């Protein structure tokens, strides 16, 4: 791939992200001063596990839908075979949402944007998965420290998705080449913007892996406690991606 093709790929990826980012950074920043009151927090903590799970599954599914759109608009993704598109999305859609989450995280007061206001991790108590919630917040805190630009998160999330080391790929060489060109694009962009030092500071892989693994484990626990709710109320896509 020539330097011109790599430069155009940076632009392409940034545009695909812009078109599917689902919440404007400017809006998210502006709403930091909108924080749940004590009574509102109590209301969430008193919610049934069922209702809180059901709400979060809806919101996660919505985010995952934007990531599928990102993938479909991503240079070279629709060139991959059906099997590979599925394998990359099944492994990577959740990882991308988790990275995207740092936009909706405020490190000053350790809040996340949820259903229109910012709250702390105490908001999620009824979920009954304290370790997972704390790990998500830790992950966001660690990303906040990188202070990603929009362009950086676009290029980085492209790479989270185009990962040729995912098990079950048919056209591994094809995915390797896509990944490599995306690395070129990421590196070109970072060099130009004097940001290459951040590469060495990115979350280890296995950090994202663990978060996704924990999500799957907690869902299995919930589904065994409330099997009817999942089949009745959860999005089919969510069940397909995360159920056993």
């Amino acid at each position: 791939a020539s330097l011109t093709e790599i430069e155009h790929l940076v632009q392409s990826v940034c545009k695909s992200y812009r078109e599917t980012c689902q919440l404007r950074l400017e809006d998210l920043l502006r709403q930091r001063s909108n924080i749940f009151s004590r009574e509102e927090v109590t209301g969430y903590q008193r919610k049934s596990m069922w209702e809180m799970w059901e709400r979060c599954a809806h919101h996660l599914t919505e985010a995952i839908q934007y990531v599928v759109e990102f993938a479909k608009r991503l240079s070279g993704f629709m060139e991959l075979c059906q099997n590979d598109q599925i394998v990359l999305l099944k492994a990577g859609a959740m990882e991308v949402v988790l990275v995207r989450m740092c936009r909706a995280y405020n490190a000053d007061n350790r809040t996340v944007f949820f259903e229109g206001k910012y709250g702390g991790m105490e908001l999620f108590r009824a979920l009954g998965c304290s370790e997972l919630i704390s790990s998500i917040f830790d992950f966001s805190h660690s990303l906040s420290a990188l202070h990603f630009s929009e362009d950086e998160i676009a290029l980085y999330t492209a790479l989270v998705l185009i990962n040729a080391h995912r098990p079950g790929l048919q056209e591994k060489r094809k995915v390797e080449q896509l990944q490599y060109n995306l690395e070129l694009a990421f590196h070109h962009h970072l060099c130009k913007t004097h940001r290459q030092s951040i590469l060495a500071k990115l979350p280890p892989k296995g950090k994202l892996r663990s978060l996704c693994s924990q999500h799957v484990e907690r869902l299995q626990i919930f589904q065994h406690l409330h099997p009817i709710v999942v089949q009745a109320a959860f999005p089919p896509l969510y069940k397909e991606l995360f159920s056993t």
């Binding site: 599928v68 479909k72 059906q82 598109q85 599925i86 099944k90 397909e240 991606l241």
Partner: peptide, 10 residues
């Protein structure tokens, strides 16, 4: 195994 994911790809 993944028809609902496959549908959104179309």
């Amino acid at each position: 195994e993944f028809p609902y994911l496959l549908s959104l790809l179309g």
